């Protein structure tokens, strides 16, 4: 039989330290192709090792198609489903949201995250992501999102983006031998993403401009120290605008994001408790 392996690379949709992402075509169908830099080979190995352990299949996890290693140097590609609307970060820049769309986005992210976190017997190991952020979430045409990039993921039976690092990562108190520690770092990051999205939800004719978390207190490409001073020493958290308190949905979302941002990691909500709270809003 013929094993059709040719992928036509059509346009670059992302470039960074990690390498490049391309829209490609296989047998007439769009795929996404991540071509890894030499600098970031261990991300390809860790994602490939994870998928060789458990073939994750979930509507809120970016869909795996293939890992390819080709002898040239060594060329490393990760092939996934393609989401033409791009990342949540991309989408929020010039889209505003209503209540239904905002809730659908954040509950879909919580659903993907709880699926990663939960151990299933007979199944999957528990998985922590370790680099959750709006650039690592894609928007689907149906209004739900999916979580991408398991290059830093850890399983239980490169470091994270500094802007999204939890206080225990910045002050190096994280209990590194404890898998629940890593889930709690993802919940912190989830709360920041929830803040990013909620800002873009309209209420009473008002909306905030897109900003990244901590835009008002750290520079672009903040240092580890910049972040530690804000999050650990001064214990700052993202601003909740007054206008949210006129809207029941944004009032409930503010409470939720507060319960993802406790200094004490074990006080933070779990992904499953966040889902339940989101299903009871509106």
Which residues are at the interface with ligand LU8 (CB under 6 A)? Answer: 3-5, 13-14, 21, 26, 32-34, 65-66, 68, 78-80, 82-84, 86-87, 90, 136, 138, 148-149
Neighbour tally for 61: CB within 10 Å: 19
Burial letters for 181-220: b for 16+ Cβ neighbours within 10 Å, e otherwise?
bbbbbbbbbbbbbbbbbbbbbbbeeeebebebbbeebbee
* Residue 125 Cβ vs ligand LU8, minimum distance, rounded to whole Å: 19
* Residue 57 Cβ vs ligand LU8, minimum distance, rounded to whole Å: 12
20 among annotated binding-site residues: yes
16 among annotated binding-site residues: yes
Residue nearest to ligand LU8 (CB): 86
Burial letters for 158-178: b for 16+ Cβ neighbours within 10 Å, e otherwise?
eebbbbbbbbbbbeeebeeee
The two three-digit tokens of residue 142, written as one number: 């149906």
Q: Which is nearer to ligand LU8, 65 or 217 (CB)?
A: 65
21 among annotated binding-site residues: yes
* Residue 83 Cβ vs ligand LU8, minimum distance, rounded to whole Å: 4
Q: Which is nearer to ligand LU8, 76 or 187 (CB)?
A: 76
Q: Give CA separation, 79 vs 2, 46, 51, 68, 148, in Å.
A: 20, 15, 12, 8, 12
For residue 261, which phi and psi values (nearest 5 degrees)? -115, 15
Burial letters for 13-24: b for 16+ Cβ neighbours within 10 Å, e otherwise?
bbeeebbebbbb
228 among annotated binding-site residues: no
Active centre residues (catalytic): 131
Q: Which is nearer to ligand LU8, 56 or 232 (CB)?
A: 56
SS3 96: coil
Q: Which is nearer to ligand LU8, 14 or 241 (CB)?
A: 14
* Residue 2 Cβ vs ligand LU8, minimum distance, rounded to whole Å: 7
**Judging by DSSP bridges, how do beta strands 126-128 and 74-81 pair with one another?**
unpaired
User: Closest by alpha carbon to 50, among 62, 60, 37?
Assistant: 62
141 among annotated binding-site residues: no
- Binding-site residue ranges for ATP: 13-21, 34
Residue ranges of the annotated binding site are 13-21, 34
């Amino acid at each position: 039989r013929t094993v059709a392996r040719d992928i036509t690379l059509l346009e670059c949709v992302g470039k960074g330290r990690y390498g490049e992402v391309w829209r490609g075509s296989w047998q007439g169908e769009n795929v996404a192709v991540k071509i890894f830099s030499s600098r970031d080979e261990k991300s390809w190995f860790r994602e490939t090792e994870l998928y060789n352990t458990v073939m994750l299949r979930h509507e809120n996890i970016l869909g795996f198609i293939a890992s390819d290693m080709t002898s040239r140097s060594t060329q490393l590609w990760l092939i996934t489903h393609y989401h033409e609307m791009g990342s949540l970060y991309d989408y929020l820049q010039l889209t505003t949201l209503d209540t239904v769309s905002c809730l659908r986005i954040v509950l879909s992210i919580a659903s993907g995250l709880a699926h990663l976190h939960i151990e299933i017997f007979g199944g999957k190991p528990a998985i922590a992501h370790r680099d959750l952020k709006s650039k690592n979430i894609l928007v689907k045409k149906n209004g739900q999102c999916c979580i991408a990039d398991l290059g830093l993921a850890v399983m239980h039976s490169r470091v994270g983006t500094k802007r999204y690092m939890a206080p225990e990562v910045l002050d190096e108190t994280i209990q590194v031998d404890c898998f629940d520690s890593y889930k709690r770092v993802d919940i912190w990051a989830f709360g920041l993403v929830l803040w990013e999205v909620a800002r873009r939800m309209v209420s009473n004719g008002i909306v905030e401009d897109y900003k990244p978390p901590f835009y008002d207190v750290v520079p672009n490409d903040p240092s580890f120290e910049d972040m530690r001073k804000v999050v650990c020493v001064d214990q700052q958290r993202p601003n909740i605008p007054n206008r949210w308190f006129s809207d029941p949905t944004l009032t409930s979302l503010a409470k939720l994001m507060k319960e993802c941002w406790y200094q004490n990691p074990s006080a933070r909500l779990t992904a499953l408790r966040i889902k339940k709270t989101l299903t009871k809003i509106d």
